[PDB]
Design a protein around this nucleic acid. Structure first.
Length: 134
RNA sequence: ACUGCUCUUUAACAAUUUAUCAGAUCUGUGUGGGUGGCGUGUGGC
């Protein structure tokens, strides 16, 4: 509940920067000093903000075609949760396929449009050939 | 050291009972506008 609830708090900073176009350092400083968030472990916050590496844009380019909803109309909350759900095993692979998938779908279940997690899980079929440690 | 192991492919609708044949006017800035109340005292006649 310390590394688990970590991601459901850094998705906030991710979306925040995405709307603000600031630096990730700015948004992380403001998020931490904004509310004392202990559901995230500080180092896992550091890892999730390192989850703004260029490869993240890359995991947007791979799963681009087989998206049941187009890129230039997807919700920013969906953009962030998608980046995280694909990055869970881009390099980190802290937990295997099912664990990280369920993590992304549930700990971000309370942010979508009542159905978004369905289609993000459905696009996760295109996530298979890059999430190899099944 | 010893919770976590895919939930399966982005919204799921309101308007609704006679009656219809759709069926004259865009003027101002002519003109003025832009000491006193009371008390008391003093005198006078």
């Amino acid at each position: 509940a310390a590394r688990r609830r970590a991601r459901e708090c850094a998705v906030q900073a991710l979306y925040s920067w995405q709307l603000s176009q600031n630096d990730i350092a700015d948004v992380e400083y403001q998020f931490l000093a904004e509310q004392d968030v202990k559901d995230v472990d500080v180092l896992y916050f550091r890892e999730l903000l390192a989850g703004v590496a260029t490869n993240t844009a890359y995991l947007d380019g791979l799963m681009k075609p087989y998206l049941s909803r187009l890129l230039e109309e997807l919700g920013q909350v969906e953009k962030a949760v998608l980046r995280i759900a694909l990055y869970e095993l881009s390099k980190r692979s802290d937990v295997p396929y099912k664990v990280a998938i369920n993590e992304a779908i549930e700990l971000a279940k309370s942010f979508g449009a009542e159905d978004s997690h369905k289609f993000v899980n459905g696009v996760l079929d295109k996530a298979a050939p890059v999430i190899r440690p099944n």
